């Protein structure tokens, strides 16, 4: 039963292939032994004295009184709760940016996360750690040691000692029942319901020539989309985005999903990754066949940031120089946010110019839209989203009971809160400590 | 690796300077010469002995 090694893990030893190896190879041993002179031990044990009439419970109450004077003991408890919430919120945020690492629920799994390297999970864990060091401004470094090995994808703590007979005592220390991790799972689950409030958008992107003169609403498209991947006579571009140029008098053809060269003028489903490595072949060949009303592409970004450019419908506007800028800033690095052009809704019935528009989304992304004119009698020309009463049921709804909402679907701007009025005492303000 | 590694982008950006170097079409031209320079040298010393 000689305790040979007392060991502390930083990494869960079962997700790496290490379930059968010994404890001295999975966990990290402590290695400290400060030397003691026995001659100082023998003297100090064999000739210690005290006061004569020493009542020792009096002597300790005299001595231990200025160590329980305030919150000396109760700072480690406040530090321990933050090191539990920031540990789960680092374990959740690392294992949600990977394909199923931990049982952790994944509500925004639909957003694309390509990079799952340990270098990428080290930047996620470090910025979660920098958020808890900024919000709570705790100066001592919390969880700035689970990234000592390199990966926080397998961040799970465990401590174990090992006697000489192999009788290893090994008990884990799992994090307790969190509370911010429960709250961060409701911000995420609501985020998918309305990401348009944070300027993100669902659905894809359509580039068809639409020479409209009346109302145009790119974020909220009426009726169905022109086509969807896998429809009739709809082709998906191959992963290179290459174009085989045909000779004297024929037309150049895209290379579709597969190896077959299909001709450009028709319909196309451009995935977002192909457009990041073929923009110089997009803007030279297929994009003139978009402008001339021949082909229609579907730049199927999964989710994207958008950017609205409002304009006056009295004056003409071609949306092609705003799209040609957007196709120019596309690298293999990343795309700029999608530029939609929505007309400013006019109060009076006007004579609108014939304008050429291209980019309009597929799924309805016009959620973060408040009434078009909130200080006019009626919106004549443009879209007239009045102040929608669904976000305000605490104000206009008659059969609204105080205490309810609809949290994983919408946001309710007018609710009934509790406003606490606590008083925070010191330890001297509760008991008498003298 | 780097902190943002796309394995298809990294290899395509690094192999395209290699296929500009036409060493694949030099090493075939040095082979057909050393075929013709072998048989005209093998028989040139096997006609003497």
């Amino acid at each position: 039963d000689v305790i040979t090694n007392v060991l502390v893990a930083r990494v869960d030893p079962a997700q790496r292939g290490d379930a059968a190896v010994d404890i001295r190879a999975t966990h990290a041993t402590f290695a400290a032994a400060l030397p003691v002179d026995p001659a100082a031990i023998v003297v100090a044990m064999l000739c210690g004295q005290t006061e004569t009439n020493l009542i020792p419970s009096h002597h300790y109450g005299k001595a231990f009184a200025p160590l329980f004077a305030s919150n000396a003991m109760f700072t480690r408890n406040q530090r321990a709760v933050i090191t539990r919430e920031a540990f789960v919120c680092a374990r959740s945020a690392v294992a949600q940016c990977q394909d199923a690492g931990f049982l952790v629920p994944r509500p925004l799994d639909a957003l694309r996360q390509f990079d799952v390297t340990s270098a990428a999970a080290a930047e996620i864990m470090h910025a979660v750690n920098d958020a808890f060091k900024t919000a709570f401004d705790l100066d001592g470094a919390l969880l700035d040691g689970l990234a000592l090995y390199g990966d926080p994808r397998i961040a799970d703590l465990s401590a174990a000692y090992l006697q000489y007979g192999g009788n290893v005592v090994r008990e884990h220390v799992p994090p307790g029942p969190s509370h911010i991790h429960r709250a961060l799972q409701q911000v995420e689950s609501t985020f998918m319901a309305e990401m348009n409030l944070f300027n993100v958008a669902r659905g894809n992107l359509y580039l068809v020539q639409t020479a409209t003169n009346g109302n145009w609403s790119p974020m909220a498209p009426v009726a169905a989309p022109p086509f969807v991947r896998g429809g009739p006579n709809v082709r998906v571009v191959g992963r290179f985005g290459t174009i085989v140029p045909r000779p004297n008098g024929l037309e150049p053809q895209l290379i579709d999903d597969g190896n077959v060269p299909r001709d450009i003028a028709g319909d196309w489903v451009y995935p977002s990754d192909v457009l990041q490595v073929s923009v110089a072949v997009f803007r030279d060949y297929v994009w003139p066949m978009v402008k001339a009303g021949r082909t229609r592409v579907l730049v199927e970004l999964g989710h994207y940031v958008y950017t609205l450019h409002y304009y006056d419908p009295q004056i003409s506007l071609d949306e092609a120089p705003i799209l040609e800028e957007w196709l120019s800033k596309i690298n293999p690095a990343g795309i700029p946010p999608v530029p939609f052009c929505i007309p400013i809704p006019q109060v009076y019935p006007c004579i609108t110019a014939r304008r050429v528009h291209y980019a309009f989304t597929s799924e309805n992304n016009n959620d973060s839209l408040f009434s078009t004119n909130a200080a006019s009698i009626d919106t004549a020309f443009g879209e007239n989203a009045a102040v929608s009463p669904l976000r305000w049921p605490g104000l206009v709804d008659p059969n609204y009971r105080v205490g309810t909402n609809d949290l994983p679907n919408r946001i309710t701007l007018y609710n009934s809160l509790y406003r606490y009025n606590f008083t925070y005492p010191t330890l001297d303000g509760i008991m008498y400590v003298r | 690796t780097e902190t943002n590694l796309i394995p298809s982008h990294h290899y395509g950006k690094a192999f395209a300077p290699l296929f500009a170097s036409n060493a694949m079409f030099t090493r075939n031209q040095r082979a057909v010469i050393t075929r013709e320079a072998f048989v005209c040298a093998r028989s040139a010393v096997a006609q003497c002995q």
Binding site: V277, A280, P332 | K13, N22, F25, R30
Partner: peptide
């Protein structure tokens, strides 16, 4: 030497073509 340019498409820059010995193509065509 049989290759002149290889104009890339992702970045659109032109990649031109150039005890041992640097091997060269034997002068076949005369």
């Amino acid at each position: 030497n049989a290759i002149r340019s290889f104009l890339t498409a992702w970045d659109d820059i032109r990649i031109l073509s150039p005890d041992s010995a640097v091997a060269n193509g034997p002068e076949l065509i005369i």
